[PDB]
Nucleic acid binder design. Structure first.
Lengths: 138, 180, 48, 157, 98, 128, 154, 59, 41
RNA sequence: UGCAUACUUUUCCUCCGCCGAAAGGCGUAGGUAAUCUUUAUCAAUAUAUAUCGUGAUGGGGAUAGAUUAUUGCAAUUAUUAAUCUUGAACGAGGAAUGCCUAGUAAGCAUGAUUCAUCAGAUUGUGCUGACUACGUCCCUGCCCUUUGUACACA
RNA sequence: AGCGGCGAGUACACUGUACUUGCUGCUUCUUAGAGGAACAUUGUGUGUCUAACACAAGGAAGUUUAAGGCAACAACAGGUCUGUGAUGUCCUUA
């Protein structure tokens, strides 16, 4: 029927709604190829191949973009789509292939399924750099 | 099952020194479509080598003047460089980079007496010398940075004098041999 | 007399009687020199 | 018609007035409380607006201001703290003390935690000052309320 | 009916009173609203003189705001709150129908 | 073709016209961009084909442009407060106007004029 | 190189399904051929933005802005006069003083907005105060989007 | 010139004027070659030397 | 200094060194022969 | 025009439609505030194509001149500022020094403060995510022990 | 504030879509009240086989997961009476 999952690495956010359909995988309004940078488009294409174009042909994903840089947004989108496909396989479509899909996703890397805690720290004291200090005179 | 820039699966790898291969950790585990992978690199000791060599090149070639942070520009330059290499050299650009890395890295040095060099250090200084040769090639020489990178990497793959890495590992070897 | 409603002399400190180093953030109009010790009695704690 | 953000800082100004006013007026006894003697206080407050560490510290300040010896006054007040119930008390007095050289005496007894946020939460503070013929005296009384239980305090029955 | 304060437990217990009164009176009371806690930060520097390593400390104000709604008479709730509120907590009353 | 001699140094033969006409005058490039725009010369071509008629058009546009669509705000020397109006007067006469205002400054003997005679700026470079 | 392989199913129903740069240039050529608006001559002697400090040097910048304004109007249901200024905000290096972002000139964007208002492509109402594109403009831009999509597809 | 294989199994210790040199043992012939190395050397790595019968000083 | 002109592999850097010409006129010559930096077709 | 007297609240950020390149002004939406500024969004290095294509050049922006408006009863020692012209050195910096152990170096910006006006100051935050150790006392600053003192204001 | 559902659609797909306007099945997702998880956990190892630390695996969390604030004993003849109607003493007051 439908599932709603989330993905957040860095400041960027992503909410992914996965529903049955004819393959309308749309990132809000714009498509996934028209972003402009193909370097991130390759990473967006990466999770698609490990799962299956024929499988994705039967489901529509509503993907929302809100905030963060290019890399942060692409990472959040990847987390959102990975959790969406895992939850949809757990819920509706098929359970037998879910274990294989999650095993191969875990084997390839750890950042595809769950993101990283790596973030920006509060500014300390001493210098403009987060770990710098003023050039003390003598 | 992975092609580099959707082009090179690099299924064939030379025997090399059977240690630089482990250090660069090139495999389907580290197979990547495009550079700038943000996996953990400073977790433990071995994660310095767990990073792909293609990622290390784009992480380390971007250090001169105002170029700090221009990692997308680094990706563009290296992606164009692979196309240049595939044209003006018939061999695979990945094989060109691999041969240049295995044969261009210094083997021993001096800090005091002469000592050896770690294998992760060997691949590190190989990357460093390739990048810094690219820097001096692009430093106000009319000719462009992409052509500079391609020429330096193919010259270091063919073991010629025009490669800064090749002409500098020789200096390191001779100075360390003279010391000990 | 020439009192003006603008500039440095428009308002002075409400306690220390010196208008230098007045903080107007959040419309307090209390000089920082006294505010350093008035922070706790107002109930405005320091944690980090 | 004021915001909550400015309303709370107006309230902070009001409590800034109230703290010093209570300090001035509460001089003959301890802390008997506040209202949300009494007739005059309420009249003035409305006109303008439209175990006791502080009491013990004021008592010691009175004993020093009356010209009684600091040593005996401090010893007595420390005994009253001990019999009141605080496990200890950190009292320090500074000034001229009969000489031209600044000096201070520290009376140490017991646990006497002196830093850390749990210490600040458990321990209340008092610090007073007053004039003298050729200077100003400073008194600090640190009273620690009985310990929820301290994380370091461990025992198994 | 929305309540605002600075400290934590004084509004949690008052909202518990709101919930228990809602259960007792079986009203058309909507669920709790958990507004984000806003923090207000100002700056001030130690060393009242000009010398010494200049040091800067930050204090925080943690404002609070939680909303609820009920379908009943305003007099009973405006007595019930005053029964079991603290002076440090402020409330505002808005009524609803359905 | 290349290296064409005009009143100013115009050896600009290989570069583009929009820099060729700025090098001689208006090296800020915005006055000579508008002059080129008025003369309607294609910027795609280079400076190796500067016909004499195009330079004639440049000088024709330069000669009292106030009669054209250009407003006075874009033109330098908007008023130069006096009984009458003026315009940009190209190169040598431009520096002649500058030195005329300078000598008027000197005979007016302002405080900033005194500093200028002493060899100082207006705001103050703050050597203190 | 402009066209790239796509694994998912397309819809091709509006300009949201087409890339921004290609559509804005194609529609700049379309309006240049159709002669719907003026150049205009008054914008010629004023640079694009105060922070730009130099001529754009393309001879079609006004038409590119004209093709992009309604492009952003479709994307956002309501916009503002300062919305275009912020979107086209540029670096300003005040000489020795460091760089800061600055908004472009508002009169030129106001004038081109008046131009499309005269063209009828954009309408204004008391409700939804921000600029929105009219129903006729919706089908016009939809047909133009599908019209470019079909040639760029095969 | 030439490069020949070596094997490191255990880390004996570190020395040097800054702590950046670690004593290691190589394996070509013997089957034991004292040598000194810099940088990260782990357990089980494969290295290369200059000459097969030059020995360092154990500290 | 430069002495390149416009009067007499397809990459601009290679052909500019081949013909001793500036990069802009080199790009123009490339366009003329075929009929900022980009990858090949 | 100036003083005296009564009416709304003009005394913040402002979205709008225009005037004016702009500055700025005009009558206004909203808001004592996750509602309105404004945050389904405020920047930049990036991304792509283009003029140029390493010549102190068109890089560079010191400098002064002509002025349009605001801040301020007062900008002259030209505050702030939209426009143009004017065109200094600068080929990456010697003897030397400061910061640096992972959203951290470094670079890129943004909010707050003092503000009638004015950050190039300090602070809060976000983006671009790197070169490297993962230890040591050889330098330096501190610490202990032992020892020698004719030092104790050491 | 988010995810949906339908009342009317703007054009195309085909046996929903980019976008509005009115109501509400619900709250991982916009947000947060308390709590828990993480403790060298386990396993292979060193260690006077005690106190310890290494690699790998589960795990977001293996240098306390990391920046922070509280900073004693004691001193400076360091600064501040130009911050106070806090402040002694010498000095001014038509």
């Amino acid at each position: 029927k439908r599932v709603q999952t989330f993905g957040k690495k860095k400041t960027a956010v992503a909410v992914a709604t996965v529903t049955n359909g004819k393959g309308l995988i749309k990132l809000n309004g714009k498509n996934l190829d028209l972003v402009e940078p193909y370097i991130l488009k390759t990473k967006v294409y990466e999770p698609l191949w490990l799962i299956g174009s024929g499988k994705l042909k039967n489901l529509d994903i509503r993907i929302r973009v809100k905030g963060g840089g290019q890399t942060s947004q692409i990472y959040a989108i990847r987390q959102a789509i990975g959790k969406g496909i895992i939850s949809y396989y757990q819920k509706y479509v098929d359970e037998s292939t879910k274990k294989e899909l999650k095993d191969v996703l875990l084997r390839y890397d750890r950042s595809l399924l769950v993101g990283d805690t790596r973030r920006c720290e509060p500014k300390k004291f001493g210098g403009k750099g987060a770990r710098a200090r003023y050039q003390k005179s003598y | 099952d992975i092609k580099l820039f959707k082009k090179w699966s690099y299924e064939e790898i030379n025997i090399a020194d059977l240690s630089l291969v482990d250090c660069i950790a090139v495999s389907q585990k580290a197979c990547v479509y495009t550079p700038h992978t943000a996996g953990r690199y400073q977790k433990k000791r071995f994660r310095k080598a767990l990073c792909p060599i293609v990622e290390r090149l784009v992480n380390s070639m971007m250090m001169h003047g105002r170029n700090n942070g221009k990692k997308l520009k680094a990706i563009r330059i290296v992606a164009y460089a692979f196309e240049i290499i595939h044209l003006m050299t018939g061999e695979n650009p990945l094989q060109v980079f691999v041969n240049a890395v295995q044969k261009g890295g210094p083997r021993e040095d001096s800090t005091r007496q002469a000592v050896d060099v770690s294998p992760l250090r060997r691949v590190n200084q190989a990357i460093y010398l390739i990048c810094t040769g690219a820097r001096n090639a692009a430093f106000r020489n009319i000719k462009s940075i992409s052509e500079c990178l391609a020429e330096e990497i193919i010259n270091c793959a063919n073991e010629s004098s025009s490669s800064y890495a090749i002409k500098k590992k020789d200096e390191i070897e001779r100075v360390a041999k003279a010391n000990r | 007399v020439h009192p003006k409603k603008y500039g440095q002399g428009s308002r002075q400190c409400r306690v220390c009687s010196n208008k230098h180093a007045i903080i107007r953030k959040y419309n307090i109009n209390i000089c920082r020199q006294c505010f350093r010790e008035r922070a706790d009695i107002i109930g405005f704690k320091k944690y980090r | 018609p004021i915001s909550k953000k400015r309303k709370f800082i107006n309230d902070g100004v009001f409590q800034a007035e109230l703290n010093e006013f209570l300090a001035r007026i509460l001089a003959e006894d301890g802390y008997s409380g506040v209202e949300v003697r009494i007739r005059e206080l309420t009249s003035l407050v409305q006109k303008r607006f439209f175990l006791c560490a502080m009491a013990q510290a004021e008592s010691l300040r009175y004993k020093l201001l009356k010209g009684l010896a600091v040593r005996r006054a401090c010893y007595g007040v420390l005994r009253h703290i001990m019999e009141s119930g605080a496990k200890g008390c950190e009292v320090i007095v500074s000034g001229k003390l009969r000489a031209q050289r600044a000096k201070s005496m520290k009376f140490r007894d017991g646990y006497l935690i002196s830093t850390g946020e749990p210490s600040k939460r458990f321990v209340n503070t008092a610090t007073r000052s007053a004039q003298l013929k050729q200077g100003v005296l400073g008194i600090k009384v640190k009273i620690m309320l009985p310990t929820s239980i301290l994380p370091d305090n461990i025992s198994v029955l | 009916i929305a309540l605002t304060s600075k400290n934590l437990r004084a509004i949690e217990k008052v909202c518990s009173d709101i919930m228990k009164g809602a259960k007792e009176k079986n009203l058309n009371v909507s669920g709790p609203v958990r507004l984000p806690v806003k923090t207000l930060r100002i700056t001030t520097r130690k060393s009242p003189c000009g010398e010494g390593t200049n040091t800067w400390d930050r204090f925080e104000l943690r404002i609070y705001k939680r909303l609820i709604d009920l379908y009943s008479q305003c007099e009973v709730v405006t007595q019930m709150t005053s029964i079991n509120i603290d002076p440090v907590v402020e409330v505002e009353v808005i009524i609803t129908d359905s | 073709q290349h290296i064409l001699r005009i009143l100013n140094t115009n050896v600009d033969g290989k570069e583009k016209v929009i820099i060729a006409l700025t090098a001689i005058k208006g090296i800020g490039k915005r006055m000579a961009t508008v002059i080129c725009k008025q003369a309607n010369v294609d910027p795609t071509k280079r400076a190796g084909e500067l016909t004499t008629e195009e330079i004639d058009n440049i000088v024709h546009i330069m000669s009292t442009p106030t009669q054209f669509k250009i407003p006075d705000w874009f033109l330098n020397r908007r008023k130069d407060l006096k009984e009458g109006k003026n315009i940009h007067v190209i190169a040598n006469q431009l520096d002649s106007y500058l030195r005329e205002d300078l000598e008027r400054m000197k005979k007016i003997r302002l405080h900033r004029g005194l500093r200028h005679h002493w060899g100082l700026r207006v705001r103050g470079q703050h050597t203190k | 190189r402009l066209l790239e392989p796509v694994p998912f199913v397309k819809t091709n129903n509006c300009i949201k399904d087409v890339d921004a740069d290609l559509f804005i240039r194609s529609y700049a050529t379309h309006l240049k051929l159709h002669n719907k608006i003026t150049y205009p001559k008054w914008c010629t002697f004023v640079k694009t933005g105060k922070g730009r400090k130099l001529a754009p040097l393309n001879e079609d910048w006004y038409f590119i802005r004209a093709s992009s304004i309604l492009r952003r109007l479709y994307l956002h249901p309501d916009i503002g006069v300062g919305f275009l200024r912020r979107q086209f905000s540029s670096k300003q290096r005040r000489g020795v003083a460091p760089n800061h972002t600055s908004l472009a000139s508002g009169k030129i964007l106001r004038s081109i907005l008046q131009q499309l208002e005269n063209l009828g492509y954009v309408e204004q109402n008391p409700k939804k105060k921000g600029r929105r594109l009219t129903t006729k403009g919706e089908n016009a831009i939809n047909n133009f989007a599908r019209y470019i999509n079909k040639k760029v597809y095969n | 010139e030439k490069s020949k294989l070596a094997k490191v199994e255990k880390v004996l210790g570190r020395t040097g004027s800054r702590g950046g040199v670690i004593q290691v043992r190589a394996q070509f012939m013997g089957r034991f070659l004292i040598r000194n190395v810099k940088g990260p050397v782990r357990e089980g790595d494969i290295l290369a030397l200059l000459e097969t019968e030059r020995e360092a000083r154990r500290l | 200094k430069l002495n390149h002109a416009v009067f007499i592999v397809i990459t601009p850097s290679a052909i500019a060194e081949k013909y001793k010409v500036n990069l802009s006129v080199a790009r123009a010559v490339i366009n003329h022969l075929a009929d900022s930096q980009k990858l090949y077709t």
